[PDB]
């Protein structure tokens, strides 16, 4: 059957405000592991290893993400941890993975402005998400030319994302008329609705960087207040997709937008097979979306790197993972010298049944910019972990 076992770590929020988003990632990672095990496992030095896993609950709590990371690295001695969602959770974890010279694989869309030697990324950087989204909302949406109002959670991802949006929209000649943050999990949206009505009396663009289940209150409250597509108000969201939409109800999201690398509505054999397999394993009701596709790819990229390294030692796997390619559900993906993923970019409008109608797509994959080329501190910097004269951040 198999010669031996390897145990990997899985670390995600199964409780608290982020469980709405992260719970389905554990199921997707498990599906990649079960597919790999059914195909014969991972081959190292002529021997077939079964992939086993340990799942730790990060509990929507950043200090918990750091403590569970110490446990998986030092107690369980896993060769990789698949995990994280919030940039807060990842920033709390980063010093653990760096100080122990370990390996986190992180799948979620984020702000960039980071290039850890101890982290690989499958989530969009801003040039693979928010930069094309900003341009599409300002030039092509029904609110083209109108001002932007920024709403997000009070932590590093939304604050950094919105800094980049402000520089970009300034360069396009657009205007920001509002920027408000809610504490993560906070459901009191009424004061921000009053600010939107005063700043955008004739409709416009709302950039949503809310993370986790406060999104439920946000979409329900804005609709009840008449901040709707029919009244000329369009939301572009970066941190929810088909799974969360299924929990909230598509009646609340129809006509709003998203920007992702994978969407369940991609009409390819690879996309249809991923969605069919997920539903066959976990139920007909179950969606797939970008966060899940990102998490799925992590497990297959890791497995391809191990087989090329002929080692589970993360020191060697991290070296060899740069340049690994995969025929993913979204299309072809490639791990770059900056530890991020070249990915295809899609703009979608949410339909009555909670799918994206794909309106804009790149002809092929876009190279990720870890260091943002709109933000003044990062302009002209890159990351390249393959060259000792380059590293984390060089001109
Ligand atoms: Ca739960
Ligand atoms: Ca190590
Ligand atoms: Ca991705
Ligand atoms: Ca309508
Ligand atoms: Ca870069």
Give residue 59 CA to ligand 1 midpoint distance, Å. Answer: 9
Preceding-residue numbers of gaps in the chain (C–N over 2.5 Å): none
Q: What is the DSSP string of 28-52?
A: HHHHHHHHHHHTT-EEETTEEEEEE
Among all ligands shown, which has an atom nearest to the Cα of 231?
4
Provide the 10 A C-beta neighbour count for residue 285: 7
| Cα gap 66→187, rounded to integer Å | 27
14 is in an annotated binding site: yes
Strand order in the sheet with 233-237: 176-182, 148-153, 204-209, 233-237, 257-260, 346-350, 356-361
Among all ligands shown, which has an atom nearest to the Cα of 79?
2
Residue ranges near ligand 2 (ion) with Cβ within 5 Å? 101, 314-315
34 is in an annotated binding site: no
| Cα gap 162→218, rounded to integer Å | 18
Q: Tokens 């807060």 sit at which residue? A: 88
| Cα gap 51→46, rounded to integer Å | 16
* Method for structure elucidation: X-ray
Measured in angstroms, the resolution is 1.8
Q: Find, among 15, 125, 4, the residue nearest to 65 by Cα.
A: 15
Distances in Å between the Cα of 275 and the Cα atoms of 27, 254, 267 are: 13, 21, 11
Q: Coil, helix or strand for 106? A: strand
Contacts of 267 (CB under 8 A, 6+ apart): none
Spatial contact of 322 and 335, defined as CB atoms under 8 Å apart: yes
Spatial contact of 328 and 296, defined as CB atoms under 8 Å apart: yes
Contacts of 201 (CB under 8 A, 6+ apart): none
- Angle ∠(118,31,43) on CA atoms, nearest 5: 65
Spatial contact of 288 and 311, defined as CB atoms under 8 Å apart: no
Among all ligands shown, which has an atom nearest to the Cα of 291?
3
Helix (H) or strand (E) segment spanning residue 8: strand 4-12
Among all ligands shown, which has an atom nearest to the Cα of 229?
4
Q: Coil, helix or strand for 1? A: coil
Helix (H) or strand (E) segment spanning residue 67: helix 62-70
Give residue 393 CA to ligand 5 midpoint distance, Å. Answer: 8
Give residue 16 CA to ligand 1 midpoint distance, Å. Answer: 8
| Cα gap 59→16, rounded to integer Å | 6
| Cα gap 206→215, rounded to integer Å | 13
86 is in an annotated binding site: no
Q: Find, among 355, 209, 343, 362, the residue nearest to 288 by Cα.
A: 355
Q: Find, among 182, 201, 203, the residue nearest to 191 by Cα.
A: 182
Q: What is the DSSP string of 289-349?
A: -HHHHHHHHHHHHHHHHHHHHT---HHHHHHHHTT-EEEETTEEEEE-TTS-EEB--EEEE
Give residue 343 CA to ligand 3 midpoint distance, Å. Answer: 7
CA end-to-end span of the chain, whole Å? 51
Give residue 257 CA to ligand 4 midpoint distance, Å. Answer: 15
75 is in an annotated binding site: no
Contacts of 226 (CB under 8 A, 6+ apart): none
294 is in an annotated binding site: yes
From the centroid of its chain, how far is CA 180? 22
Q: Coil, helix or strand for 170? A: helix
Q: Find, among 342, 353, 339, the residue nearest to 392 by Cα.
A: 339
Spatial contact of 114 and 97, defined as CB atoms under 8 Å apart: no
Spatial contact of 290 and 262, defined as CB atoms under 8 Å apart: yes
Q: What is the dihedral of CA 182, 187, 190, 196, to 10 degrees?
A: 50
Phi, psi of 348 (to 5 degrees): -130, 145
Q: Given this structure, which CATH class describes domain 127-260?
A: alpha beta
Write down how long the chain is: 395
Give the pair of three-digit tokens for residue 11.
Answer: 């670390």
């Amino acid at each position: 059957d198999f010669d031996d076992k390897v145990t990997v770590g899985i670390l995600h929020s199964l409780t608290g405000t982020m469980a709405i988003s992260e719970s389905t990632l554990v199921d997707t990672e498990k599906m990649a592991i079960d597919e790999i095990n059914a195909a014969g496992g991972v081959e190292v030095d002529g021997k077939k290893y079964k992939i086993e896993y340990i799942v730790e609950d990060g509990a929507s709590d950043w200090p918990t993400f750091a403590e569970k990371s110490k446990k998986l690295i030092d107690q369980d001695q896993v060769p990789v941890v698949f995990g994280g969602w919030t940039s807060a959770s990842r920033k709390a974890m980063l010093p653990v993975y760096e100080s122990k010279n370990a390996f986190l694989y992180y799948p979620i869309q984020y702000e960039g402005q980071e290039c850890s030697n101890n982290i690989f990324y499958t989530g969009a950087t801003p040039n693979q998400q928010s930069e094309p989204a900003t341009k599409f909302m300002y030039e092509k949406s029904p609110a083209a030319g109108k001002p932007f109002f920024l709403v997000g959670s009070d932590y590093v991802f939304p604050r950094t994302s919105n800094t980049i949006t402000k520089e970009q929209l300034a360069s396009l000649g657009g205007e920001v008329v509002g920027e408000d943050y809610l504490p993560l999990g906070n459901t009191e949206v009424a004061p921000i609705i009053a600010k939107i009505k005063k700043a955008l009396p004739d409709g416009g663009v709302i950039i949503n960087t809310l993370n986790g289940d406060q999104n439920v209150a946000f979409f329900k409250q804005i609709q009840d207040a008449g901040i709707t597509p029919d009244n000329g108000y369009y939301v572009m969201s970066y941190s929810i997709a088909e799974e969360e939409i299924s929990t909230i109800g598509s009646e609340f999201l129809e006509g709003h937008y998203g920007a992702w690398n994978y969407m369940m509505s991609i009409d390819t054999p690879a996309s249809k097979k991923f969605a069919a397999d997920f539903k066959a394993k976990y139920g007909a009701d179950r969606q797939v979306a970008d966060p899940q596709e990102s998490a799925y790819n992590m497990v297959y990229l890791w497995k391809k790197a191990v087989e090329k390294a002929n080692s589970f030692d993360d020191d060697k796997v991290r070296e060899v993972l740069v340049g690994i390619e995969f025929d993913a559900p979204q299309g072809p993906v490639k791990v770059m010298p900056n530890h991020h993923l070249s990915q295809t970019v899609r703009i979608g409008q949410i339909t009555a049944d909670g799918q994206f109608e794909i309106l804009e797509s790149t002809d092929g994959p876009v190279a990720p910019q870890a260091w943002n080329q709109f933000e003044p501190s990062s302009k002209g910097f890159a990351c390249d972990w393959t060259d000792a004269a380059k590293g984390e951040k060089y001109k």
